[PDB]
């Protein structure tokens, strides 16, 4: 099964014309992140059939030289945002390795769908493109991954992400849920979460190769 | 209103250059479990790490107005309030 077929079925079932017109006009008249050419990068680097793990984010980073179409990732030569710092701290405490780059393209290639629920945002405006239609799309993606794949790990950080358990068949799929790695929430249960070993233990339990979380 | 406004607001209250890197939406239950108070409405937590190693968090209301609500610095076991509406 290919993204092409899944995107086709999703775009039959819902009219995205109004969204594509709006987004056309937005890129014309505003700074919109990430660059047009990266909106779907999470899909390009992680074909449907290579999905081992789904990590949900909210909306892309809204500062320059930050978002590139992956959840949590930023550009290689960009400041490490706090949530990533805490992801990297736990990863060192959990797996052992210390990541020197804040780019998560290697994760995506390993089989981690780094899917933001909302795939665009206006500069400096958190949630600016919430409910222009991106959640309709993303929800169908999450539903598709659950319906057609056999045994996938969904990692759900914070309650907004955890609302998507509705779309997951929790009898087929592994659910790793915890408080957000944001510095507001991290010390109240994200440290010692061990989402990375837990994911790999589950993948080996169903005959899938571990994800190499390190570089 | 946008991140410039929140950067200026938070820069005034700390008297050094603040640039917020990320904005994460939290539910009221989530704000409660972390700071002790349960708001009536979703908050967005705009966060940054500074050169001196300090972690600054501005909680605001939702889009479109991102009205401040609390400003916090991270301590060993908890937080330090640097601004509050209450």
CATH number, domain containing residue B12: 3.10.450.20
Specify burial of residue A100 (Cβ count, 10 A radius: 0-12, 13-18, 19+).
Answer: exposed
Non-local CB neighbours of A97 within 8 Å, separated by 6+ positions: A91, A213, A214, A215
Cβ distance of B22 and A83 shorter than 8 Å: yes
Burial B22-31 (b: 16+ CB within 10 A, else e): bbbbbbeebb
Q: Does A64 touch chain B (CB under 8 A)?
A: no
Tokens representing residue A112 in the block: 């981690």
Whether residue A42 contacts residue A113, with contact meaning beta carbons closer than 8 Å, is answered with: yes
Residue in B with minimal Cα distance to A178? B30
* Closest of A111, A101, A89, A96 to residue A155, by C-alpha: A111
Residue in B with minimal Cα distance to A58? B24
A190 three-state secondary structure: coil
Q: CA A21: distance to chain centroid?
A: 25
According to DSSP, the residues that pair with A95 across neighbouring strands are none
Whether residue A184 contacts residue B24, with contact meaning beta carbons closer than 8 Å, is answered with: yes
Total count of domains within chain A:
1
For chain B, give the secondary structure using H, E and C.
CCHHHHHHHHHHHHCCCCCCCEEEEECHHHHHHHHCCCCCCCEEEEEEECCCCCEEEEEECCCCCCCEEEEEEECCCCEEEEEECC
Q: How many CB pairs under 8 A join A and B?
A: 92
Determine the straight-line distance between the first and last CA of chain B, rounded to whole angstroms: 22
Q: How far apart are CA A145 and CA A54, in angstroms?
A: 9
Whether residue A127 contacts residue B25, with contact meaning beta carbons closer than 8 Å, is answered with: yes
Tokens representing residue A95 in the block: 């797996």
Q: How far apart are CA B81 and CA B16, in angstroms?
A: 17
Total count of domains within chain B:
1
Residue in A with minimal Cα distance to B78? A187
Residue with tokens 């809204």: A62
Domain of residue B52 covers 3-84
For chain B, how long is the longest CA-to-CA vector? 34
Specify burial of residue A121 (Cβ count, 10 A radius: 0-12, 13-18, 19+).
Answer: buried
Resolution, Å (one decimal): 2.6
Catalytic position from the list A9, A15, A35, A59: A59
Cα of A165 to nearest chain B Cα, Å: 17
Is A44 among the catalytic positions? no
Q: CA A36: distance to chain centroid?
A: 18
């Amino acid at each position: 099964m290919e993204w092409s077929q899944i995107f086709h079925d999703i775009t039959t079932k819902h009219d995205f014309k109004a969204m594509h017109d709006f987004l056309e006009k937005e890129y014309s008249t505003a700074i919109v992140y990430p660059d047009r050419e990266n909106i779907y990068q999470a899909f390009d680097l992680t074909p449907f059939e290579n999905i081992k793990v789904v990590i949900l984010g909210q909306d892309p980073y809204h500062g320059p030289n930050q978002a590139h179409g992956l959840a949590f990732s930023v550009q290689p030569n960009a400041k490490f945002p706090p949530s990533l710092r805490n992801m990297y701290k736990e990863l060192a405490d959990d797996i052992g390795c210390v990541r020197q780059t804040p780019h998560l393209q290697d994760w995506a290639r390993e089989g981690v769908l780094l899917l933001n629920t909302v795939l665009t945002v206006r500069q400096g405006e958190a949630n600016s493109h919430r409910d222009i239609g991106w959640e309709t799309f993303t929800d169908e993606i999450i539903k598709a991954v659950s319906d057609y794949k056999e045994h996938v790990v969904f990692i759900l950080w914070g309650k907004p992400a955890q609302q998507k358990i509705k779309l997951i068949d929790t009898s087929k799929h592994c659910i790793i849920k915890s408080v957000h790695p944001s510095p507001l929430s991290a010390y109240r249960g994200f440290f010692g979460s061990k989402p990375y070993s837990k994911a790999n233990t589950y993948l080996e339990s169903v005959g899938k190769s571990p994800i190499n979380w390190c570089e | 209103k946008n991140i410039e406004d929140l950067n200026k607001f938070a820069s005034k209250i700390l008297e050094t250059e603040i640039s917020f890197e990320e904005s994460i939406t939290f539910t009221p239950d989530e704000v409660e479990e972390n700071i002790g108070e349960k708001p009536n409405r979703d908050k967005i937590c705009h966060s940054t790490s500074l050169e001196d190693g300090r972690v600054i968090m501005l909680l605001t209301e939702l889009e479109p107005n991102y009205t401040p609500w609390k400003l916090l610095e991270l301590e060993e076991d908890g937080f330090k309030e640097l601004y509050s509406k209450s």
